[PDB]
Design an enzyme around this catalytic site. Structure first.
Site, PDB file in Angstrom:
ATOM      1  N   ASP A  25       0.731  -1.501   0.018  1.00 20.84           N
ATOM      2  CA  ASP A  25       0.138  -0.039  -0.221  1.00 20.84           C
ATOM      3  C   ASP A  25       0.618   1.298  -0.025  1.00 20.84           C
ATOM      4  O   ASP A  25       1.386   1.865   1.138  1.00 20.84           O
ATOM      5  CB  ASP A  25      -1.144   0.053   1.235  1.00 20.84           C
ATOM      6  CG  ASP A  25      -1.748   1.237   1.199  1.00 20.84           C
ATOM      7  OD1 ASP A  25      -1.869   2.022   0.383  1.00 20.84           O
ATOM      8  OD2 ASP A  25      -2.638   1.198   1.997  1.00 20.84           O
ATOM      9  N   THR A  26       1.151   1.713  -1.133  1.00 16.99           N
ATOM     10  CA  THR A  26       1.951   2.732  -1.233  1.00 16.99           C
ATOM     11  C   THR A  26       1.221   4.200  -0.532  1.00 16.99           C
ATOM     12  O   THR A  26       2.111   5.144  -0.555  1.00 16.99           O
ATOM     13  CB  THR A  26       2.473   3.072  -2.737  1.00 16.99           C
ATOM     14  OG1 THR A  26       1.217   3.404  -3.615  1.00 16.99           O
ATOM     15  CG2 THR A  26       3.316   1.955  -3.235  1.00 16.99           C
ATOM     16  N   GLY A  27       0.398   4.085  -0.466  1.00 18.21           N
ATOM     17  CA  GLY A  27      -0.324   5.308   0.157  1.00 18.21           C
ATOM     18  C   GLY A  27      -0.366   5.144   1.654  1.00 18.21           C
ATOM     19  O   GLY A  27      -0.884   6.231   2.509  1.00 18.21           O
TER      20      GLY A  27
HETATM   21  C1  LIG Z   1     -12.432   2.445  -3.117  1.00 21.20           C
HETATM   22  O1  LIG Z   1     -11.423   3.370  -3.236  1.00 21.20           O
HETATM   23  C2  LIG Z   1     -10.957   3.631  -2.022  1.00 21.20           C
HETATM   24  C3  LIG Z   1     -11.094   3.159  -0.800  1.00 21.20           C
HETATM   25  C4  LIG Z   1     -10.205   3.308   0.453  1.00 21.20           C
HETATM   26  C5  LIG Z   1      -9.462   4.241   0.392  1.00 21.20           C
HETATM   27  S1  LIG Z   1      -8.389   4.527   1.657  1.00 21.20           S
HETATM   28  O2  LIG Z   1      -7.633   6.158   1.480  1.00 21.20           O
HETATM   29  O3  LIG Z   1      -9.064   4.277   2.642  1.00 21.20           O
HETATM   30  N1  LIG Z   1      -7.060   3.509   1.693  1.00 21.20           N
HETATM   31  C6  LIG Z   1      -7.534   2.020   1.853  1.00 21.20           C
HETATM   32  C7  LIG Z   1      -6.431   1.295   2.493  1.00 21.20           C
HETATM   33  C8  LIG Z   1      -6.224   1.860   3.884  1.00 21.20           C
HETATM   34  C9  LIG Z   1      -6.995  -0.220   2.468  1.00 21.20           C
HETATM   35  C10 LIG Z   1      -6.009   3.788   0.803  1.00 21.20           C
HETATM   36  C11 LIG Z   1      -4.562   3.869   1.745  1.00 21.20           C
HETATM   37  O4  LIG Z   1      -3.296   4.021   0.967  1.00 21.20           O
HETATM   38  C12 LIG Z   1      -4.594   5.402   2.430  1.00 21.20           C
HETATM   39  C13 LIG Z   1      -4.520   6.300   1.769  1.00 21.20           C
HETATM   40  C14 LIG Z   1      -4.606   7.767   2.820  1.00 21.20           C
HETATM   41  C15 LIG Z   1      -3.268   8.328   3.151  1.00 21.20           C
HETATM   42  C16 LIG Z   1      -3.447   9.457   4.104  1.00 21.20           C
HETATM   43  C17 LIG Z   1      -4.935   9.623   4.723  1.00 21.20           C
HETATM   44  C18 LIG Z   1      -5.970   9.227   4.263  1.00 21.20           C
HETATM   45  C19 LIG Z   1      -5.741   8.174   3.199  1.00 21.20           C
HETATM   46  N2  LIG Z   1      -3.394   5.324   3.507  1.00 21.20           N
HETATM   47  C20 LIG Z   1      -3.645   5.165   4.845  1.00 21.20           C
HETATM   48  O5  LIG Z   1      -4.542   4.767   5.236  1.00 21.20           O
HETATM   49  O6  LIG Z   1      -2.541   4.912   5.642  1.00 21.20           O
HETATM   50  C21 LIG Z   1      -2.702   4.907   7.075  1.00 21.20           C
HETATM   51  C22 LIG Z   1      -1.833   3.851   7.475  1.00 21.20           C
HETATM   52  O7  LIG Z   1      -0.587   4.340   7.461  1.00 21.20           O
HETATM   53  C23 LIG Z   1      -0.633   6.065   7.506  1.00 21.20           C
HETATM   54  O8  LIG Z   1      -0.140   6.460   6.151  1.00 21.20           O
HETATM   55  C24 LIG Z   1      -1.255   7.436   5.752  1.00 21.20           C
HETATM   56  O9  LIG Z   1      -0.543   8.877   6.011  1.00 21.20           O
HETATM   57  C25 LIG Z   1      -0.945   9.139   7.326  1.00 21.20           C
HETATM   58  C26 LIG Z   1      -2.035   8.847   7.620  1.00 21.20           C
HETATM   59  C27 LIG Z   1      -2.320   7.555   6.611  1.00 21.20           C
HETATM   60  C28 LIG Z   1      -2.308   6.101   7.676  1.00 21.20           C
HETATM   61  C29 LIG Z   1      -9.100   4.886  -1.231  1.00 21.20           C
HETATM   62  C30 LIG Z   1      -9.553   4.476  -2.226  1.00 21.20           C
END
Ligand SMILES: COc1ccc(S(=O)(=O)N(CC(C)C)C[C@@H](O)[C@H](Cc2ccccc2)NC(=O)O[C@H]2CO[C@H]3O[C@@H]4OCC[C@@H]4[C@H]32)cc1
Lengths: 99, 99
Positions: A25-27
């Protein structure tokens, strides 16, 4: 491998002894599992996400094996709806995004 | 390009005529932007992630430019804290994860 994204990029991961599966999960900045058995005390940590913020359990210097790489990292245990391998772990195995 | 993951993998994209920034996010099934105004019809959708659910507007068959390629596909719009480019969009530009 070179992984296309037509399906979710799940990988096999051995984490602190147990064979699990998790989403590359690159995000995600952090690596987080829901219910792995890790020995010992943990420190409380907060983590954000799309829906708000969660209390999680932080475990340090946990061995993680992906695609034949053994790395030592921070592993969070928390109510994520899917196990995720975040950038903290992916940098240790040299992962890149290419287009 | 070939992007390492030591920092968040933001990219420039053009959407609804505006230059925006968004994470190339392999854990995201769909692309989501906050505060963009699109012209077509939308349908309500709910997505879920860490910390819970997000209500969004789904716009189908929307043009987006990412790097230099014109991608037509689904774009969700809603109050996410960070804009993300999801797998559906990334597959159309042949983006891959490598290690
Ligand atoms: C159906 O389509 C969708 C459905 C869900 C999502 S998402 O944003 O909820 N997500 C799904 C994933 C959790 C299974 C994508 C992730 O890449 C999100 C993307 C994301 C990033 C930042 C904020 C909100 C979301 N990242 C995230 O939740 O990271 C968490 C864990 O690590 C921390 O790093 C991040 O950076 C700091 C906080 C978050 C924390 C996107 C598109």
């Amino acid at each position: 491998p070179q992984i296309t994204l037509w399906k979710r990029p799940f990988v096999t991961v051995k984490v602190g002894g147990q064979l699990k599966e998790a989403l590359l999960d690159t995000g995600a900045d952090n690596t987080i599992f829901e219910d792995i058995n890790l020995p010992g005390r943990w420190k409380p940590k907060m983590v954000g996400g799309i829906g708000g913020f969660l209390k999680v359990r932080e475990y340090d210097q946990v061995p993680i094996e992906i695609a034949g790489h053994k790395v030592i990292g921070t592993v969070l245990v928390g109510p994520t709806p899917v196990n995720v391998i975040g950038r903290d772990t992916m940098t240790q195995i040299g992962a890149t995004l290419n287009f």
